[PDB]
Design a protein around this ligand. Structure first.
Ligand code: IBP
Length: 121
């Protein structure tokens, strides 16, 4: 769920999910279209695609458990939707950490009309 996702992001980046990653680019947070603006926005796009592979799960409200083993994120065993949701989020958080150096404030609150395009998962 969002709860877990938000806390993973903070632990990983030292940034709060809202609002550093909830209105960024074309996909972070409220996506649907266009070309992702940078590496961080691409993390969000792949994250959307990851969720997109679980039609019958509810990644926003279904809660899972994970633990840190030294720095590593380890998803604990829950239902099959939970395991798979956690793997999607874990990847997004690492992707965020990896591109933290190009994170740009120019992309916060990015306007909808500039998200245009077509990009298939
Ligand atoms: C963090 C808080 C603002 C929740 C939030 C943000 C964006 C979305 C979109 C609709 C999505 O997840 O597809 C859902 C929930």
């Amino acid at each position: 769920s969002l709860l877990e996702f938000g806390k993973m992001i903070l632990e990983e980046t030292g940034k709060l999910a809202i609002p550093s990653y909830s209105s960024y680019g074309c996909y972070c947070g409220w996506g649907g279209k266009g070309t992702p603006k940078d590496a961080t926005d691409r993390c969000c796009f792949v994250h959307d695609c990851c969720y997109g592979n679980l039609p019958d799960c509810n990644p926003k409200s279904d809660r899972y458990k994970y633990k840190r083993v030294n720095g590593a994120i380890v998803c604990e065993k829950g239902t099959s939707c939970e395991n798979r949701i956690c793997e999607c989020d874990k990847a997004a958080a690492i992707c965020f950490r990896q591109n933290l150096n190009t994170y740009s404030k120019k992309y916060m609150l990015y306007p909808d009309f500039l998200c245009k395009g077509e990009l298939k998962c």
